[PDB]
């Protein structure tokens, strides 16, 4: 039990404080799931609604983990980064393939001339 917690607080729960709690639980609620929880229950949540928001945040962490794990399969350069070249190869070869230009535009809009942090890339995409 929290040794330093007061006495007050209720009549709902601010979603900023709910995002704070999820983040301490080892999650990372984005603006998207923070938006759809507003566009459903409002600026403050009941305990049941807080649980659903946490569940939502569990799914998004699992999704991000899968993406980071995916890009790491092509990490020949020990660990951390991938080149724009490797990146466009993935994005133009598989799925709803982006065109050569679409792959360039997106990677050029992201950052460095030849080196991309794929962990931050996935964070942003989700």
């Amino acid at each position: 039990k929290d040794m330093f917690n007061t006495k007050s607080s209720n009549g709902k729960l601010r979603i900023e404080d709910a995002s704070h709690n999820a983040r301490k639980l080892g999650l990372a609620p984005s603006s998207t799931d923070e938006k759809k929880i507003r566009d459903l229950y409002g600026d403050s949540l009941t305990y049941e609604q807080y649980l659903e928001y946490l569940t939502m945040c569990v799914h998004d962490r699992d999704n991000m983990e899968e993406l980071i794990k995916m890009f790491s399969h092509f990490d020949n350069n020990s660990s951390g980064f991938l080149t724009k070249n490797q990146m466009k190869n993935i994005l133009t070869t598989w799925g709803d393939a982006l065109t050569e230009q679409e792959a360039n535009d997106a990677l050029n809009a992201f950052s460095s001339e030849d080196r991309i942090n794929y962990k931050l890339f996935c964070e942003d995409i989700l």
Partner: peptide
């Protein structure tokens, strides 16, 4: 999946 990544990239026009 990669399908998700591509769809989000496209949503950024």
């Amino acid at each position: 999946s990669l399908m998700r990544v591509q769809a989000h990239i496209r949503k950024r026009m």
